[PDB]
Amino acid sequence: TLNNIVSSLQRNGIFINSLIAALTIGGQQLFSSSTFSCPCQVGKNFYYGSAFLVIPALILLVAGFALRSQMWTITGEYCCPLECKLACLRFFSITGRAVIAPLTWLAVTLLTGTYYECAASEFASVDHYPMFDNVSASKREEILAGFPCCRSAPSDVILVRDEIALLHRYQSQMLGWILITLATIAALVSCCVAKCCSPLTSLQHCYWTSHLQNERELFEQAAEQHSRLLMMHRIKKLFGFIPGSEDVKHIRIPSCQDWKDISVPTL
Template identity: 75%
Template structure:
């Protein structure tokens, strides 16, 4: 969802770019697909909870209708609420009549909870079926092109992450070599460089990623000071002789 919203809401994009109707339809298709997949986990948890009935029984026992039970005729309303709220706690000191009422109320609540659970499952299944059918009918792409487009986006994201990781590693290794004179993990270290106080101050300063007037974005806290060092300054390191 973050990638999807950044593509259409990012302020770094061209201000005059117009989104075509095809892009809007594909964006809506992806939005509803992401939303549907995100709702699977909470709906599943809610359905399982309702089918089990324990949470519903605890929540609804205080509001159960017990006016037709004679055991509650001489019980005040506040005491009745207290007794009903304690039904799920299974108190052993209750009378036999109260235990009978408690079991009947618990059984009724379990029936209601399971009924709500199956209704939720039916509605969710129907909604998913209708949504999938509408998505395929309203999609501007045929089925084979839709599959290709989906796999293309997945492969693009995966390869981009691999390339970005490799690129950042190479860039950081280059700047570390300019700062210290060697790359971590290198076996053949013949020259090291001692950073100056100005170097440490430069790399300790906060960096800004996308500056409006800059030709390149600065993604490293090692700073421009290290990148801009001349070759004469780099050659003034300490040579390590075997």
């Protein structure tokens, strides 16, 4: 009874998407907890933030796109009427699967926010504080970029540090919620538009998806079996018996040329 429930969940898109999201959340948490430390350098902080904020998104997005077998076939159809719209719908479905990873990564990393504070710990507009009046500009940059990582200064400095940190965390979390709401509204309007521009009815679509999936599977199985049978026939012509046999009473010794013959694969 196992394989029944296995296939049932494997078809169920909700479970697969939820598992992907959970995996990305856990991986992000472990990653951030292990190998993250703000540089607290002079001008090389914003890059160290932006990298961790963005690059994983691009990587996971490209990976989630390119790993889908159907996308390669669609590109091959495209690379050097109704077929165009159907290709667009196919591509859109694969996109709807693949987008789940980068958006959830961005969401969790903005909500925890510990990345963003390092990303923009230098842009804090300081104009209404007593300790930043007389000090030099470069001295201000130095004392400003050192805030996130450590603290050893007097009380007022660590208090203004706490204040800047809270402000930046607020900004990060608001930006995260904005990203979530915009992503959701865009996904909804896009799915509705795709359902609108579809040339098929509410029933031909399901038939079509089943057609595609079962086509791929059956053709794979058939090609495998056919090539196996043909290679088996060549083997039997060479040695004199079918390999899957038993108690064979006839054996043909090969000639010093038959090896040369079987060398080519006939493609």
